[PDB]
Paper text:
Here, we have determined the structure and molecular architecture of the Ty3 capsid by 3D and 2D cryo-electron microscopy (cryo-EM) and compared it with those of the retroviruses. In the case of Ty3, Gag3 is cleaved into CA and NC domains. Formation of the capsid is important for genome protection and is an essential step in the retroelement life cycle. Similar to retroviruses, the protruding capsomers of the Ty3 capsid are formed by the CA-NTD, while the inner layer, linking the capsomers together, is formed by the CA-CTD.
Numbering used by the authors:
A (entry chain A), B (entry chain B): 105 to 195
Amino acid sequence: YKPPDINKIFNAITQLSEAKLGIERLNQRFRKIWDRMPPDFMTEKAAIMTYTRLLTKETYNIVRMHKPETLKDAMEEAYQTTALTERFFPG
Amino acid sequence: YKPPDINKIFNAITQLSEAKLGIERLNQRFRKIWDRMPPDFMTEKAAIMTYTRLLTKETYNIVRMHKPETLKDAMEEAYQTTALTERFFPG
């Protein structure tokens, strides 16, 4: 195992924004940084919180209906509102 | 009881800085905002984290020796480095 260095991780999440083009840039880097060694970082509800306040205001309105439970649902649901009427299908 | 409204609380902590004159301004408002309805906000270590990265760099160095455990120790220890060689004694 390794030492965690938590403060860079709170530093690295702070860079992410809505200037990132579309949801796919947001969901990718957040998979990169946040999954990199959380030993026990916070509870489930608080892990929603730092994710959700980052997001765009309109996407919070549609993800209000319905509200998700985990990050995976939140990452999926905020993707699906733009994945529907837009795609390039990768392989 | 009341609805919590968590997002204002993360908004209100963001205003605090090192432009606040001395530690006493920092420790007072943080007692006001953070104690106002945390139902279960986060774990103990994470509650250290949002407190500590706010603080001044030199105060992190002295509070490194020794590192505190709870917020109360952290609020006390970062006060004591300036409460020693400076006071107006209140009543």
